[PDB]
Design a protein around this ligand. Sequence first.
Ligand SMILES: Nc1ncnc2c1ncn2[C@@H]1O[C@H](COP(=O)(O)OP(=O)(O)OP(=O)(O)O)[C@@H](O)[C@H]1O
Ligand SMILES: Nc1ncnc2c1ncn2[C@@H]1O[C@H](COP(=O)(O)OP(=O)(O)OP(=O)(O)O)[C@@H](O)[C@H]1O
Ligand code: NA
Ligand code: NA
Lengths: 227, 228, 220
Amino acid sequence: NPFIRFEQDKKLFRNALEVEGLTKGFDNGPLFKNLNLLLEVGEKLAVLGTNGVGKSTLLKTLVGDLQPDSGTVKWSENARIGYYAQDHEYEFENDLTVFEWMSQWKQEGDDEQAVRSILGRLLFSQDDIKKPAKVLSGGEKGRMLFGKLMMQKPNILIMDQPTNHLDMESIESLNMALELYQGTLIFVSHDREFVSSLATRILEITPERVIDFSGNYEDYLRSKGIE
Amino acid sequence: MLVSSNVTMQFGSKPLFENISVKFGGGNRYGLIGANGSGKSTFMKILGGDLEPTLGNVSLDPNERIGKLRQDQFAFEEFTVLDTVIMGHKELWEVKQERDRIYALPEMSEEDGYKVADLEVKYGEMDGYSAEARAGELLLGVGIPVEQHYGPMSEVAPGWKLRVLLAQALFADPDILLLDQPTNNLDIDTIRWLEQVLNERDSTMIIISHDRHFLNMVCTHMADLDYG
Amino acid sequence: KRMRVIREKVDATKQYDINEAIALLKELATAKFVESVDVAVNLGIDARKSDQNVRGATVLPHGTGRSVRVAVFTQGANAEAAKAAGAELVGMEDLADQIKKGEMNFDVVIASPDAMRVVGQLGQVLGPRGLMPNPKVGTVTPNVAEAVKNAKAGQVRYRNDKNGIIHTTIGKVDFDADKLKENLEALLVALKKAKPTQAKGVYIKKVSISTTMGAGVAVD
RNA sequence: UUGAGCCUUGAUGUGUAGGAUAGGUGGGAGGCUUUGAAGUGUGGACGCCAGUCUGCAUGGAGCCGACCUUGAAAUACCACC
Ligand SMILES: Nc1ncnc2c1ncn2[C@@H]1O[C@H](COP(=O)(O)OP(=O)(O)OP(=O)(O)O)[C@@H](O)[C@H]1O
Ligand SMILES: Nc1ncnc2c1ncn2[C@@H]1O[C@H](COP(=O)(O)OP(=O)(O)OP(=O)(O)O)[C@@H](O)[C@H]1O
Ligand code: NA
Ligand code: NA
């Protein structure tokens, strides 16, 4: 059972995000129509909706790598964003040793004694820290990105499907790691258990119109009419 | 039926798995479970022959068409979706494309004509005439539109071509299915369709899955890969 | 109805005699038709494996009792050779590309090794229905004149069912028992000589002769 | 009473693009119905729920392949499965 826990270096107050008129589409036009929202601090926003629709590309626009058609996204002043992309190959195509790859993100005020502690908690013991970063398992890679988020210590976590290639032990450790998190969280998942365990607001998009909520997934289903 | 004897793969200075010897076969479905980094993908590579073991054997019958899954490649990207799912049948694909090449090159001489007649009868026996139709009746199940069935592999979306790569594996009822994490980044409806279409088949299937509700749904045996 | 009044009269369990089965079929010939008789044998082979496939064609000692226009598929001298053999088709590159492009088919196909206009033009029509000639089946013959006698002389082809059954027409209820017995024997001998190398078990399990509108019975 | 094997008889095995819930061989395509109809008057079973199978008849004596879109044709039917 890996020991994962995200902390927050500089807590930020009042609104953490605001999105004003974020219409965008690639070639179907209204991928999401006239989005308008304001995300407070401590929100755990689970963005649902399932398939081919802009379930992602919302996160990509929020981080900025996918320019929107119209609209402006105003992050908080000190907002530091930890991004866990759904497709994360580009950060491992470069072939560094696991130790160097985890050491890229060491911050001001920590050693390579403290660098290796994250890998130790992530169960990379003595030889699995000598492998090329390219040759690693899918779960052993998702964990290695979790250990980069932990190392950067963000105050806004955006995670595109953080439950990929992770066994029961990992989706039981990270679930409570994010539950103890004190900060802004934006995530997307399909399994009706991980999203239901930790969520205070649901924003799911349907290929005609977004629908927003203000409660957890159980109340969401009862209001939808699902037994 | 597939057998493996003393596979013993090792790169480093710690045992990975030792003297693995097991008979896979009989129509049973073996969910292969384990931790996040133990042996599963490098074991379904060995069972398909992608990499030979450090010292061991894998035995298969002279003709047993292994239907295995991707997610070690993404970039075929040279041809249409129909003829992309078709080439899951590595036997039929070669005869089809070779006879197309022969038709392209002039002329059908006596070497060419006698080289082609037997390939044509082989194609008929392999029922390539109704190959594209049965491929399309599966692409519709996966969720790809009929009007763009014939589009090339660049027309498809990056998040939509893993659907085609999944449909390739289970093309025409191939015995021994090597499924490596098939349900990842798939939806509830597609998962239900897949677990329904795998429930109507008599073909041993070794499946990697880290979830419980799919293994507990389809699988019969629960092969583990822990402790070595 | 007739199928309700003959089902009791004929039983499929009792493997009737070689002459008794034919006699019973002749007695039961009632439908107002020429009523071609057919024969179905159950070879013992594994159709899942290609090397145990039995593709063949032989000239029956009497004939099928029907005439089919053996369309010649050839070009050049080889295609023109069949014109003097008395065939019901004309072989040309255009005549197979345009004339044979929309044409359904002939009764059978001759083989031409010189011309090539009727090779890729068939496609779903020339191969999907099983009319394409192959060297083993004798359709792709070196000589159009040879194919004329191999098809117009009373030659019958056969390919396995997906479960390993060979059935084909043998004659008509007008034909006599003395002709039909040798007609069946020739086909049985042909299959016996055409048995593949790896044929486990007995390769002739059941032999049922039947009419179009009648039932069938085992003969051996 | 309940397992299993075997035999005999009957059903079930649409996604398009089709009239319509066509299994592959191919025998034929003009054959099925009056030892008493397609529809009707009315039962049950099955289902991707659109549609199929079956008792008997006051009356009952007429339905489909030919066309046609498909890689492929038809409960016109019998065949070996
Ligand atoms: N890089 C791209 N180039 C072109 N079109 C794209 C690109 N990325 C996405 N699209 C298009 O925009 C659509 C939105 O895809 P999106 O990432 O929102 O899907 P998703 O719901 O996250 O999918 P999945 O769960 O299958 O990963 C895609 O289906 C595709 O049509
Ligand atoms: N070239 C290599 N060098 C060193 N170690 C390697 C190499 N290739 C693979 N490995 C190791 O082999 C193991 C493979 O693990 P495996 O792929 O079975 O994990 P998984 O996440 O359970 O699988 P899956 O992706 O199939 O769900 C890992 O421990 C990985 O580090
Ligand atoms: Na996505
Ligand atoms: Na892997």
